[PDB]
Design a protein around this ligand. Structure first.
Ligand SMILES: [Cl-]
Ligand SMILES: [Cl-]
Ligand SMILES: [Mg+2]
Ligand SMILES: [Mg+2]
Ligand SMILES: [Mg+2]
Lengths: 243, 241, 191, 244, 111, 250, 235, 231, 240
C-alpha cells in the first residue's frame, strides 16, 4: 500500500487519504457553527478555556474579510488564518478591479479553488480546517461551509468540530420548526444555545462563547461582533435552556 | 510499488493513477445523460441532496462555461469546479484571441490535452472527473463531447456517465437501433428534455420528483439550465401520456 | 496622440432618460485633414446591455474595448451579469494604469433592472465620473425627447467641428432590449 | 515530497563507482559492434547493424555512422536517439569554432567538449547519463589522422584501433593480434570486416547488416574526403575481401 | 517634464567647542517666494549624543535623517547596545549618501 | 508548490534496460494494429478504428493525421499521447523550418524533430515516455516518397513496409510475402486492406477502417488558383465510400 | 532516505547532531582566556611524516584583533573564515572602527543553520574564536554548527575534548598570566595527543590588545615546551 | 512512525509529528516565566550554561522600545523570529508613525510559523516565545508556540518543569494582576513563580535574567549585579 | 534545478559520498610526486591492459595549468578535466587582475576550494579525484608540491603518492626520502620517482610517465627511451 503517505495520490478506491487525515484534525478541533437567517447570517464558536490565565474576550477566533464577510473555522487555527489572509487578498483584488465588494458565492469559490489547489501536489499539505463563512451581498444573505478537500456548499445551517453531530441535530430542528424563516436576533440566541448544547461533547474544560453576525437590518449589511448586553442576553438564554 | 503512486508506466504498460482517477468519477454516485435534438442539445443529471441543512439551489454539477457551451461533470465537486473555471477562462481567452466563440469540440480537446499532461507529468495529479461538454455549434450543429482523466475525448450521438452508465447506454443504443437516426427527431427542446427524462426513468428504474433532477439545455446562441418549476412542468407532461 | 495615427474626434454623448439610456455619436475618423472613414461605428458593445462611446485614438480605444469585453465575458461566466459601474471600473483600470501610452476618452453607458440607466465618463487622465449625461437637459425625458436632444447637440458639433461629420448613430438601451438608430445629413443639417 | 521517487543518478557506490555509468556501459555492451581502425594514409569505420529485418529500407538508413563535419565522423554504439542529441550539439560546436577562428575544428577539441557534456550528466542535474559510446574518426593539420572513443562517463582516449559495443573483449584481442603501424587503408578495411565476421552473433556477415565508412586523403592533392559507403559498395568490398 | 528636486531654502550652522558642540538652523521653510512654515524644525536629536541636519531639499533631508536614526537603532541591536561614536556615524552617513550617488539626496548635511 | 520532479523517471537498471521505454513499448503492443506500405508512386498508411462505444461518432476521432500538406501520420498505442504529438509536430514544422526556409520540411527532418521530442520525454525531469509508436508517411522533392517508424525511445527507422501494435508480428510476415519494389499505389492499398483484415476481428468496412495516402498532388484540394508552382497537397485521406469500393474487388 | 532539516523524536536536528560526531573525530584545539590576553593552541596531527607540518593551517587570523582555531572537517572552515574576514573588514568600512568579537561570532553563526533543501548540509567543523575589543575586553567563543555560541574562560574541542575540558576545569583561575596560559595549553595538549608533543606537531597563538593577533614561531613554541617540561620535573 | 519524515505529512489520527517534535525541543529548553499587571509586564528567565567555564545563554531579546520576548528552545530560531518582529515593529513606525500592537505582533508571528508547517523542504521553528509589551491598550503578555498557536495571557511559563511555575501563577492570579504602579513587586512575584520550577539548583547572580516594560518604562533587560536585588 | 543533498552526514559522523569518492581515487592509476633541491618530478602510472593505444593524442596524465605550474591526478579521468579547466581559467584571471602569475599554494587552495564546494552543494556529487599540484612561484627557486583530495583538504608534501597501491609506494618513499638531504640533482630526483613506481607498476616500458618541472617556467616531459634508461639502470643495481 503506502497510498496514505503522500498528498495528491489516489488510492485504489479513488480516495485521497491525506485529505481524509486532515479531516481528523478538523474533527479534533473545537465546535463552530453558522446560522443563516432572514436578512443575514450568524456565526458562533466554542473557545476552550484551557486555564484561568487566559484573558477573557482577547483571543478572538472569528475573522472578518473585507467589511461584509465573516469567517469562522475548526481544526488547526493557523491554517484557518492562512486561508483568511488569502481570502482578504482575493476580496481586495476583486474590489480593486470590479469596484463592487466581492459577492459571497464568488468569494466562496476563491477559497474553494485555493483549498482544492492544496490537494493537487505532494509538495503541499491539505488544509486542516473546515471553514464556515458567509455574509450579505446584492443578492441577499449567504452561508457556506468549506472542507479540506476544497468541497463547499451553501447551507441553511452549518456545523463542524468535535460537537458537530450534536450541533447538526439541533440545527435540523430549527430548519423544520422555522420554514418561513428565522430572524437575526433570534439566530444569535439560538447560536448561543447550540454552542452550549454542543459543549456536552467537550465538557472537561469549561468554555467561552463568541458570536458575530451580518444582517441587512441589524448591522446595515456589515460584519460586526456581538458584544456587551446583546452577548450577555444570548448567554442567559442558553443557560436557561440547558437547565 | 511506487509505479502505482505517480503517473508512470507499470510493467504491463498501465497508468494506475489514471485508472484510480476513473474510480473517483463515481464517488458522488450520480448518473448523467446527454442527447441531441434537431435544434438543441439536452443534458440531464441526477440531483441528490442528502443533508437537510444544505441549500439545494447551490448543489449543482452542471456549469455554464460560455454563453453557448454548457458542461456537466461526473466526479467530486472540487475537481469539477477546478475544470469549470479553467474551461471558462479558456473559452473567454479563445474569443479574445481569435474573434469568435470557442466551439464545444475545440474546448473539449483543449481540456483533454490538459488532462493528458497530468497523465505524463508527475507533479500534477489527474482530476477525478469526466467532463461532458454540450452546445449547438454554429458549424457542426447539436454537439456532445466528453473528456475523461486519461485525456481521451470523442464526439457522441448521445451519451451517459455514472455508476449505472451501462444500463442507460444500452437503453439509448436500443432506441437508436429502432429510430434508425443519429438524434431525437423533435422540434422543440421541451420534448427532447421529456425524452431524456423518460429514458433515464426506464433505464435506472426509479421515479423522479422536481428536486431529484437537474437539467441543462443548449440552443442556438445560448445554453441555460432549468429551474425546479421548469422541470416540474416537464415531469407533468410525461405523466400525462 | 501618435503622429499620423487614426483619430476618432470627440463628438460623442450618452444621455439617461426615463426608460433607460441612449448613446450617440458621429461617424467621422481622420488622419490629418483626410477623412479615413466616414461611416465609422463609435458605439461599441462590451456586454449585452453595456455599451461605450469611443474618442481619441482609434487603435487605443479598440484595444481597450476588446479587453473590457473579455473581462466582462469572463465575469459573467463566473459571477453572473455585471453592473455598469463594474464595466466602467475595468475601463478606468486600463485607462489609468496605461495613461502614459494611451489617448482614449471613453463614455460607458448601460442598463440594469435595479439601477436603470447609468452613464460613466472616463477622460484622458483615467478618472471616472458618474453623471446623468455626458458629451439644457431635463431628468426623466422621454425617448423621443432624448433622441432630439442628442440629434440637435451632435448636429451642431458637426456644423462647427471638422473632426466631426457623416451620420449620427445612436443606440437605445432599455428593458425592452437594444435598438440601433441612424440619422443622415439631409435630416440633421437643416435643423 | 518528490524525494521518495528520486533514483539519485549522480552518486557513488560504496566501492567508488558511478552506478548509472556502469549500467549504461552494460546497456552499450548489448549494442551492435562498431570498429575503428587508423592507418597511415586514412581511417576505417565499420559497424554492425542490430538484427536487421528483410523489409528494412537499407539504402536510405543511418543507424551507426554519422557525419559531424567534412573532416570528422563518428560511429555510434548504444541508444540511437541519445546519440543524435549529442551529434547535433557536436555539429553546432564545430561550426561555432569555424565561425570564430575561420579554421576547421581540431579533432580533440570537438571530442573533449562532447565528452565534457557527458561528464556533466554524471556529476550534476539528477538526470540519467547518455547511454552512448562514440568512436570519433577525423583529420586535422596538427595531428593528422586520429581515432578516439568516449563513453557515458565522459572519459575519452586515443587509439590506433578500437572497438565498442558487443564482444569488444574478443574484438580487441583480434585487432591486437593482426594490427601493425605501417598499415594501409585497404589493409585496415580488410581487418575491420574480418574482425566483425568472427565476433558477430549472426550466422554469417552480409552487406545489409553493415555500415561502413573511410576517411582518406584519396582526393586530389592535400585534401581529405569522407566516404560513407553505399549498400552496393559494401556488397562489393565484402566480396573483394572474400567473406561472401 | 517632472523635476524630482526642489529648494526648501533655510540655512544651518555647526560650531565645535572644547567640551561641547552646537548645531543651529533657522526654522523657516520656503518654496520660491512663498513661506510654507515659520516653524519647521530641521535640526534633530538622533540619539547617542548626535545631532543632525540635512539642509536643502526637505524631502531628501527628512528621508536621510530618518534613515540615519534607523541606522543608529540597528547599530544597538546588532552590537550589544554599543554607543555610536560621532566618527562612526559620519562614515555611516557617507555610505547612506553615496548609496544614491546616481540619484543624490539634494542636501548639505552637518552633524 | 512548483514542479519538484527535476530528476529522471527513466533510468538504467543493472541489466542495462531502460524500464519505462520497455514498458511504453509494451503499451504499444497492446495498442490497435496500424501499418504502412511504400509504393513506387506513393505511400499508404492504415489502421483499424477501434470504437469505444457504438454511440460514439468514430468520424470525430481521427487516428490518421495530416502534419504537412505532403506528410501524414498514424499510430499504435495511447491515443491521447498521439494527439498532443501531432499538435507539437505540426507546430515544429513551422517554427523550426517553414518560418526559416519558406517551405515545408522533408519527411526525414520532420520525423527527426518528432523523434527529438520523444527522446526528451525519455531523459528530461518529471516525465514518462510517450506510449506510442508512430508511422509517418511523406513526400518531398529531393527524397521522393518515404515511410518512417518512430518508437517511444525516440529511435526512428525507414521502412519499405511495416506494421505496429496488436498483430504486428503476423502482419509483418504477411507484408514480406506480398511486398516488391515494383508496386504501384493501388496495389499497395490493396495489400494494406488484405493485411489489415487479418488483425481486425469484428466489422471490416469504410466506417471501421481509417486509411490515407501520400500520392500525386491534388489541385482540387488546394483551395485556390493562380500560382502555377503551388499544385496542392499530396496527402489525401480516403473517404468511407472510397474504401468500400476497393473492398468489393478484394 | 529522510529530510535534511528533520527533527528527531527527542527534539534535535539529526544532521546537526551527526556533524557533532564528526567534530569529535577532529584534532584537538584548546583556547584559554586571561586578562593579559587569549591563547589559542592546536594539535596539527600530520597523517604521514612526509607531510610538511608547517603547511597545516588550523589557526587563522580574521582581523588584527580577532583570531580563530578550528577542529573537525577543516575544509568546511574556509568559507566560514572568508565570511568572518569580510564581516570584520566590512564593518570597519561602514563604521570606521573595530568590530565586536561577539558580533563577529554572531555573524559566523548565522551561516551555521543556513542549510537544507542555502547549502546542502551543516558545517562539520567547530571554531574557537578569540579576540579583544574595548567594551568587553578579552573574549573566547565556541561556535558550533548548531548556530549556537557560548563564551568561555577556557575551552577544548576535538578528540581529547572531554578529558582536556575536565583538566581545564581544575587548572583555570581568573588571575592567570599570559605565560601561565601558554604553558597550560601545551601541558593539556601533550596529555591528550596520541603522538609526543613538539614544536612541529603542535602550534600556539595569542591575541593581545597591544600587538594584536600573532601566531607563534616554531622556535618560540619550542622554548615554551622546554620551559614546560623543566617546571613539571621541578616538583 | 511512518508519518514523521517531514512537516507536509499528516498522521492517520490527524497529527503533525514534525511540529510535535519541534514542540519537544521547547520542553528540553530552560524555564522562562511571563506575567503582567495592568501597568507593567514582566519576563523572568532561567539562563542555562554549558559548564562552569561557559557563559549563560541569553534568553531575552528586545524588539522595540515598547516590546520584547524571552525564548525557550532553539536560540537561532528565536533570533530569526525576533529579527522579523524588529522589522515589523520598525515598519509600523516608519510608514505609519505608529507603535505596533502586541496583538498584531502575535498574529504576524503565527502566520510566519504556519507557512513553515505546510510547505515541503522547510521545517517548523524549534522555539517557544513569551512576548511582552505595552501599547495603546495597556500591558500585554503573549505565548508563542511553533505550531503557530499564539495565546494572550495574564501569566504563563514555558520550558523544562514549567508546570510548577504555571500552577503557582494560576493560584497567584488574583494577587499579581493588581500590582499596579509597582515594578519591583511584580518582578518579585515572577521570581517567586520561576522558583517553583527549580530542582537542586537555585537562582544566582549570573543565572537569573529579568526584563520589564510598562506605562512609563521602556523595554529594559536586567542581568548580572542588577538582579542581585531579587535573590 | 536539481537540489537534492547528496553529500550528507551519517550517524557515525561520516560523509559517505566524500569517502566513496576516495575509493574512486584508490581505484585510479598510481601517481607520485617527489621534490628535490632545485626541481619537482611528477611520476604517473599507465595501466598496460590497454594496447593499440595512440599515445600521441591520448590525454596526458600530467597537465600544465600555467607555464610554471603542473597538475597530475588519480581517480576519475572525466572529473579531472573540470578541475584542470577551472584552474587554468583562474590562473589567467589572476595574471589579469594581480599582474602576476599564481603561486603554487594559491592555485592549490583554489582547486581545493572547488572540490570542497562540491561536498556541500545541492544537486552535485564530490569530485572522485585527488590531485598533486607542483611548480615554482614567480621569481622563486624553492620547489613546491601540494596534494588535494575530494573532501577539500590540501597540504604540502616533501614527497607524496596517490592512487592504487599508493600505500606501498608511500611506504617506500617514507624510508628512502631524507628530509635533511633531498635529491640534489634532477637525475637523483627522477631516479627516486621511477624506483618508487617500480615497486608497484609491473614493467617499466610504456607504463611509466615522468614530467620534470624546474624554476622559471622550465617544464619538460620525458620520452620512452629516456625513462627506459632509468629502468635499465635500477634493475642492474638491484641484482646484488
Ligand atoms: Cl492544447
Ligand atoms: Cl474606430
Ligand atoms: Mg456555473
Ligand atoms: Mg501525474
Ligand atoms: Mg463637418
Amino acid at each position: 500500500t503506502g497510498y496514505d503517505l503522500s498528498n495528491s495520490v489516489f488510492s485504489p478506491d479513488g480516495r485521497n487519504f491525506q485529505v481524509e487525515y486532515a479531516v481528523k484534525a478538523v474533527e479534533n478541533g473545537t465546535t463552530s457553527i453558522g446560522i443563516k437567517c432572514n436578512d443575514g447570517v450568524v456565526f458562533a464558536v466554542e473557545k476552550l478555556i484551557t486555564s484561568k490565565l487566559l484573558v477573557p474576550q482577547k483571543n478572538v477566533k472569528i475573522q472578518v474579510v473585507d467589511r461584509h464577510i465573516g469567517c469562522v473555522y475548526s481544526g488547526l487555527i493557523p491554517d484557518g488564518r492562512h486561508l483568511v489572509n488569502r481570502g482578504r487578498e482575493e476580496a481586495a483584488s476583486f474590489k480593486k478591479l470590479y469596484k463592487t465588494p466581492i459577492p459571497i458565492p464568488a468569494f466562496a469559490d476563491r477559497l474553494g479553488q485555493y483549498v482544492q489547489a492544496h490537494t493537487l501536489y505532494n509538495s503541499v499539505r491539505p488544509f486542516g480546517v473546515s471553514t464556515i463563512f458567509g455574509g450579505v451581498d446584492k443578492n441577499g444573505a449567504h452561508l457556506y461551509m468549506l472542507e479540506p478537500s476544497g468541497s463547499y456548499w451553501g447551507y441553511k445551517g452549518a456545523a463542524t468540530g468535535k460537537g458537530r453531530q450534536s450541533a447538526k441535530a439541533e440545527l435540523e430542528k430549527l430548519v423544520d420548526h422555522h420554514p418561513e424563516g428565522l430572524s437575526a436576533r433570534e439566530a444569535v440566541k439560538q447560536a448561543a444555545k447550540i454552542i452550549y448544547l454542543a459543549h456536552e461533547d467537550n465538557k472537561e474544560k469549561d468554555f467561552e462563547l463568541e458570536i458575530s453576525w451580518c444582517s441587512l437590518s441589524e448591522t446595515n449589511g456589515l460584519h460586526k461582533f456581538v458584544k456587551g448586553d446583546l452577548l450577555q442576553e444570548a448567554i442567559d438564554f442558553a443557560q436557561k435552556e440547558i437547565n | 510499488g511506487y509505479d502505482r503512486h505517480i503517473t508512470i508506466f507499470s510493467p504491463e504498460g498501465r497508468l494506475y493513477q489514471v485508472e484510480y482517477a476513473f474510480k473517483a468519477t463515481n464517488q458522488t454516485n450520480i448518473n448523467s445523460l446527454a442527447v441531441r435534438g434537431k435544434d438543441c442539445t439536452v443534458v440531464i443529471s441526477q440531483k441528490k441532496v442528502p443533508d437537510k441543512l444544505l441549500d439545494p439551489t447551490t448543489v449543482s454539477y452542471i456549469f455554464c462555461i460560455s454563453r453557448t457551451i454548457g458542461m456537466v461533470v461526473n466526479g467530486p465537486i472540487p475537481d469539477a469546479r477546478n475544470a469549470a473555471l479553467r474551461a471558462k477562462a479558456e473559452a473567454a481567452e479563445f474569443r479574445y484571441k481569435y474573434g469568435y466563440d470557442m466551439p464545444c469540440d475545440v474546448l473539449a480537446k483543449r481540456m483533454a490535452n490538459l488532462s493528458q499532461i497530468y497523465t505524463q507529468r508527475a507533479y500534477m495529479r489527474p482530476l477525478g472527473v469526466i467532463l461532458t461538454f454540450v452546445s449547438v455549434d454554429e458549424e457542426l450543429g447539436p454537439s456532445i463531447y466528453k473528456t475523461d482523466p486519461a485525456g481521451y475525448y470523442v464526439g457522441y450521438k448521445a451519451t451517459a456517465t455514472g455508476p449505472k452508465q451501462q444500463e442507460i447506454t444500452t437503453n439509448l443504443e436500443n432506441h437508436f437501433k429502432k429510430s434508425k437516426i443519429d438524434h431525437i427527431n423533435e422540434e422543440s427542446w421541451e420534448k427532447v428534455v421529456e425524452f431524456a427524462i423518460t429514458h433515464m426513468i426506464d433505464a435506472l428504474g426509479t421515479e423522479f420528483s422536481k428536486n431529484d433532477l437537474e437539467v441543462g439545455v443548449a440552443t442556438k446562441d445560448k445554453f441555460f439550465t432549468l429551474s425546479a418549476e421548469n422541470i416540474e412542468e416537464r415531469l407533468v407532461a410525461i405523466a400525462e401520456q | 496622440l501618435k503622429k499620423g495615427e487614426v483619430s476618432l474626434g470627440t463628438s460623442i454623448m450618452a444621455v439617461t432618460f426615463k426608460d433607460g439610456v441612449i448613446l450617440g455619436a458621429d461617424s467621422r475618423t481622420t488622419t490629418g485633414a483626410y477623412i479615413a472613414n466616414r461611416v465609422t461605428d463609435k458605439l461599441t458593445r462590451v456586454h449585452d446591455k453595456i455599451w461605450c462611446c469611443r474618442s481619441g485614438s482609434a487603435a487605443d480605444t479598440q484595444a481597450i474595448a476588446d479587453i473590457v469585453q473579455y473581462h466582462l465575458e469572463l465575469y459573467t461566466s463566473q459571477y453572473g451579469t455585471p453592473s455598469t459601474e463594474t464595466a466602467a471600473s475595468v475601463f478606468k483600470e486600463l485607462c489609468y494604469e496605461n495613461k502614459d501610452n494611451l489617448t482614449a476618452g471613453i463614455i460607458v453607458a448601460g442598463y440594469d433592472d435595479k439601477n436603470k440607466g447609468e452613464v460613466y465618463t472616463i477622460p484622458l487622465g483615467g478618472s471616472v465620473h458618474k453623471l446623468p449625461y455626458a458629451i439644457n437637459f431635463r431628468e426623466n425625458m422621454s425617448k423621443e425627447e432624448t433622441v432630439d436632444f442628442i440629434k440637435h447637440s451632435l448636429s451642431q458639433a458637426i456644423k462647427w467641428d471638422g473632426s466631426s461629420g457623416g451620420v449620427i448613430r445612436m443606440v437605445v438601451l432599455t428593458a425592452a432590449g437594444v435598438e440601433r438608430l441612424i440619422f443622415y445629413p439631409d435630416e440633421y443639417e437643416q435643423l | 515530497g518528490s524525494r521518495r521517487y528520486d533514483s539519485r543518478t549522480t552518486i557513488f557506490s560504496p566501492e567508488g563507482r558511478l552506478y548509472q555509468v556502469e549500467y549504461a556501459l552494460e546497456s552499450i555492451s548489448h549494442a551492435g559492434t562498431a570498429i575503428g581502425i587508423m592507418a597511415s594514409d586514412g581511417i576505417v569505420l565499420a559497424a554492425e547493424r542490430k538484427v536487421t529485418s528483410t523489409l528494412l529500407e537499407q539504402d536510405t538508413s543511418t543507424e551507426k555512422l554519422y557525419k559531424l563535419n567534412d573532416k570528422i565522423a563518428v560511429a555510434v554504439a548504444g541508444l540511437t536517439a541519445d546519440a543524435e542529441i549529442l551529434i547535433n550539439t557536436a555539429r553546432i560546436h564545430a561550426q561555432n569554432y569555424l565561425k570564430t577562428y575561420n579554421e576547421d575544428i581540431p579533432v580533440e577539441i570537438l571530442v573533449r567538449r562532447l565528452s565534457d557534456i557527458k561528464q556533466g550528466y554524471t556529476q550534476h542535474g539528477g538526470l540519467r547519463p547518455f547511454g552512448v559510446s562514440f568512436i570519433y574518426a577525423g583529420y586535422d593539420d596538427r595531428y593528422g589522422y586520429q581515432l578516439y572513443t568516449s563513453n557515458p562517463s565522459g572519459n575519452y582516449t586515443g587509439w590506433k584501433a578500437i572497438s565498442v559495443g558487443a564482444n569488444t573483449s574478443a574484438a580487441q584481442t583480434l585487432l591486437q593480434m593482426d594490427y601493425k603501424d605501417d598499415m594501409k587503408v585497404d589493409d585496415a578495411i580488410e581487418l575491420a570486416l574480418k574482425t566483425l565476421s568472427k565476433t558477430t552473433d549472426s550466422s554469417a556477415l552480409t552487406y545489409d547488416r553493415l555500415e561502413f565508412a573511410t576517411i582518406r586523403k584519396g582526393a586530389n592533392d592535400g585534401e581529405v574526403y569522407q566516404k560513407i559507403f553505399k549498400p552496393q559498395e559494401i556488397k562489393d568490398i565484402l566480396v573483394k575481401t572474400g567473406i561472401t | 517634464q517632472f523635476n524630482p528636486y526642489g529648494d526648501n531654502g533655510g540655512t544651518i550652522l555647526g560650531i565645535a567647542g572644547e567640551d561641547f558642540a552646537v548645531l543651529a538652523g533657522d526654522t523657516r521653510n520656503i518654496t520660491d517666494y512663498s513661506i510654507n512654515s515659520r516653524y519647521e524644525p530641521k535640526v534633530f536629536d538622533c540619539g547617542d549624543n548626535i545631532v543632525m541636519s540635512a539642509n536643502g531639499f526637505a524631502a531628501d533631508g527628512d528621508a536621510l535623517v530618518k534613515r540615519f536614526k534607523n541606522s543608529v537603532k540597528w547599530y544597538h541591536f546588532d552590537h550589544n547596545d554599543k554607543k555610536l561614536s560621532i566618527n562612526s556615524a559620519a562614515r555611516n552617513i557617507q555610505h547612506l549618501l553615496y548609496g544614491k550617488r546616481f540619484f543624490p539626496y539634494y542636501v548639505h548635511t552637518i552633524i | 508548490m512548483t514542479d519538484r520532479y527535476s530528476f529522471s523517471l527513466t533510468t538504467f537498471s543493472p541489466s542495462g534496460k531502460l524500464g519505462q521505454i520497455d514498458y511504453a513499448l509494451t503499451a504499444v503492443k497492446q495498442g490497435v494494429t496500424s501499418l504502412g506500405i511504400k509504393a513506387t508512386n506513393g505511400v499508404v498508411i492504415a489502421t483499424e478504428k477501434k470504437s469505444s462505444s457504438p454511440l460514439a461518432m468514430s468520424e470525430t476521432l481521427s487516428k490518421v493525421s495530416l502534419l504537412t500538406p505532403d506528410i501524414g501520420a498514424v499510430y499504435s498505442g495511447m491515443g491521447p499521447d498521439y494527439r498532443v504529438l501531432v499538435d507539437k509536430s505540426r507546430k515544429v514544422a513551422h517554427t523550426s523550418y517553414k518560418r526559416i526556409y519558406g517551405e515545408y520540411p522533408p519527411t526525414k527532418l520532420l520525423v527527426s524533430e518528432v523523434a527529438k521530442i520523444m527522446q526528451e520525454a525519455t531523459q528530461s525531469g518529471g516525465v514518462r515516455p510517450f506510449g506510442v509508436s508512430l508511422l509517418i508517411a511523406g513526400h518531398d522533392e529531393f527524397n521522393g516518397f518515404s515511410l518512417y517508424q518512430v518508437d517511444p525511445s525516440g529511435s526512428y527507422f525507414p521502412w519499405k513496409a511495416t506494421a505496429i501494435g496488436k498483430g504486428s508480428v503476423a502482419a509483418k510476415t504477411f507484408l514480406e510475402k506480398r511486398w516488391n519494389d515494383e508496386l504501384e499505389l493501388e496495389d499497395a492499398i490493396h495489400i494494406a486492406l488484405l493485411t489489415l483484415k487479418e488483425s481486425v476481428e469484428g466489422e471490416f468496412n469504410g466506417d471501421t477502417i481509417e486509411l490515407a495516402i501520400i500520392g500525386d498532388e491534388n489541385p482540387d484540394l488546394l483551395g485556390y488558383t493562380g500560382i502555377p508552382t503551388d499544385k496542392g497537397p499530396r496527402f489525401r485521406k480516403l473517404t468511407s465510400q472510397e474504401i468500400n469500393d476497393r473492398l468489393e474487388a478484394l | 532516505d529522510r529530510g535534511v532539516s528533520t527533527f528527531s523524536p527527542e527534539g534535535r536536528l539529526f544532521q546537526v547532531e551527526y556533524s557533532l560526531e564528526a567534530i569529535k573525530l577532529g584534532s584537538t584545539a584548546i583556547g584559554i582566556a586571561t586578562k593579559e590576553g587569549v591563547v589559542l593552541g592546536v594539535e596539527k596531527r600530520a597523517t604521514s611524516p612526509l607531510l610538511e607540518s608547517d603547511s597545516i593551517e588550523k589557526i587563522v587570523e580574521i582581523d588584527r584583533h580577532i583570531g580563530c582555531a578550528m577542529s573537525g572537517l577543516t575544509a568546511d572552515a574556509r568559507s566560514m573564515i572568508e565570511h568572518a574576514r569580510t564581516a570584520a573588514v566590512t564593518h570597519n568600512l561602514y563604521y570606521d572602527e573595530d568590530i565586536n568579537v561577539e558580533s563577529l561570532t554572531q555573524s559566523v553563526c548565522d551561516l551555521a543553520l543556513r542549510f537544507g533543501e542555502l547549502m546542502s548540509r551543516p558545517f562539520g567543523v567547530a571554531l574557537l574564536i578569540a579576540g579583544h575589543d574595548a567594551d568587553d575586553g578579552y573574549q573566547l567563543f565556541h561556535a558550533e554548527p548548531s548556530g549556537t555560541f557560548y563564551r568561555y574562560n577556557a575551552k577544548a574541542i576535538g578528540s581529547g575534548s572531554e578529558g582536556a575540558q575536565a583538566e581545564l576545569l581544575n587548572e583555570w583561575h581568573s588571575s592567570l598570566t599570559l605565560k601561565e596560559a601558554e604553558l597550560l595549553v601545551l601541558k593539556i595538549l601533550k596529555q591528550v595527543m596520541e603522538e609526543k608533543l613538539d614544536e612541529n606537531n603542535a602550534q600556539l597563538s595569542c591575541i593581545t590588545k597591544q600587538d594584536g593577533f600573532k601566531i607563534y614561531d616554531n622556535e618560540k613554541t619550542a622554548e615554551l615546551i622546554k620551559e614546560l617540561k623543566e617546571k613539571e620535573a621541578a616538583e | 512512525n511512518n508519518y514523521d519524515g517531514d512537516t507536509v505529512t499528516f498522521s492517520p489520527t490527524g497529527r503533525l509529528f514534525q511540529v510535535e517534535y519541534a514542540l519537544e525541543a521547547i520542553k528540553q529548553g530552560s524555564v522562562t516565566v511571563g506575567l503582567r499587571s495592568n501597568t507593567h509586564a514582566v519576563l523572568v528567565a532561567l539562563k542555562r550554561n554549558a559548564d562552569e567555564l561557559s557563559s549563560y545563554q541569553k534568553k531575552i531579546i528586545k524588539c522595540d522600545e515598547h516590546m520584547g520576548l524571552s525564548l525557550a528552545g532553539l536560540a537561532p530560531d528565536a533570533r530569526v523570529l525576533s529579527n522579523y518582529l524588529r522589522q515589523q515593529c520598525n515598519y509600523s513606525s516608519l510608514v505609519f508613525n505608529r507603535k505596533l500592537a502586541v496583538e498584531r505582533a502575535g498574529h504576524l508571528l503565527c502566520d510566519k510559523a504556519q507557512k513553515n508547517t505546510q510547505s515541503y523542504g522547510g521545517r517548523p521553528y524549534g522555539v517557544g516565545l513569551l512576548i511582552i509589551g505595552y501599547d495603546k491598550s495597556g500591558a500585554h503578555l503573549l505565548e508563542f508556540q511553533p505550531s503557530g498557536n499564539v495565546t494572550e495571557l495574564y501569566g504563563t511559563a514555558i520550558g523544562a518543569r514549567s508546570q510548577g511555575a504555571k500552577t503557582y501563577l494560576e493560584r497567584t492570579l488574583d494577587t499579581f494582576i493588581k500590582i499596579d504602579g509597582n515594578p519591583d513587586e511584580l518582578i518579585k512575584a515572577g521570581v517567586e513563580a520561576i522558583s517553583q520550577s527549580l530542582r537542586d539548583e537555585s537562582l544566582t547572580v549570573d543565572n537569573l535574567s529579568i526584563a520589564i516594560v510598562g506605562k512609563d518604562t521602556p523595554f529594559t533587560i536586567y542581568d548580572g549585579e542588577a538582579v542581585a536585588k531579587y535573590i | 534545478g536539481y537540489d537534492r543533498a547528496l553529500s550528507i552526514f551519517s550517524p557515525d559522523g561520516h560523509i559517505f559520498q566524500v569517502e566513496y569518492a576516495l575509493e574512486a581515487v584508490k581505484r585510479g592509476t598510481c601517481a607520485v610526486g617527489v621534490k628535490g633541491k632545485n626541481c619537482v618530478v611528477l611520476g604517473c602510472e599507465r595501466r598496460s591492459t590497454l594496447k593499440l593505444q595512440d599515445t600521441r593524442i591520448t590525454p596526458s596524465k600530467v597537465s600544465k595549468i600555467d607555464s610554471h605550474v603542473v597538475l597530475s591526478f588519480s581517480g576519475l579521468n572525466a572529473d579531472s578535466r573540470i578541475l584542470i579547466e577551472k584552474a587554468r581559467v583562474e590562473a589567467q584571471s589572476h595574471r589579469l587582475t594581480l599582474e602576476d602569475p599564481v603561486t603554487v599554494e594559491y592555485l592549490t587552495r583554489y582547486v581545493a576550494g572547488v572540490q570542497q564546494r562540491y561536498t556541500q552543494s545541492g544537486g552535485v556529487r564530490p569530485f572522485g579525484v585527488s590531485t598533486l599540484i607542483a611548480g615554482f612561484d614567480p621569481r622563486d627557486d624553492e620547489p613546491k608540491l601540494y596534494q588535494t583530495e575530494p573532501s577539500g583538504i590540501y597540504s604540502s608534501w616533501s614527497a607524496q603518492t596517490i592512487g592504487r597501491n599508493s600505500k606501498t609506494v608511500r611506504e617506500f618513499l617514507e624510508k628512502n626520502y631524507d628530509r635533511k638531504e633531498p635529491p640534489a640533482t634532477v637525475e637523483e630526483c627522477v631516479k627516486l620517482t621511477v624506483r618508487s613506481l617500480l615497486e608497484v607498476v609491473q614493467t617499466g616500458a610504456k607504463n611509466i610517465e615522468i614530467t620534470v618541472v624546474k624554476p622559471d617556467s622550465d617544464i619538460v616531459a620525458l620520452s620512452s627511451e629516456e625513462i627506459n634508461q632509468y629502468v635499465t639502470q635500477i634493475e642492474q643495481e638491484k641484482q646484488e
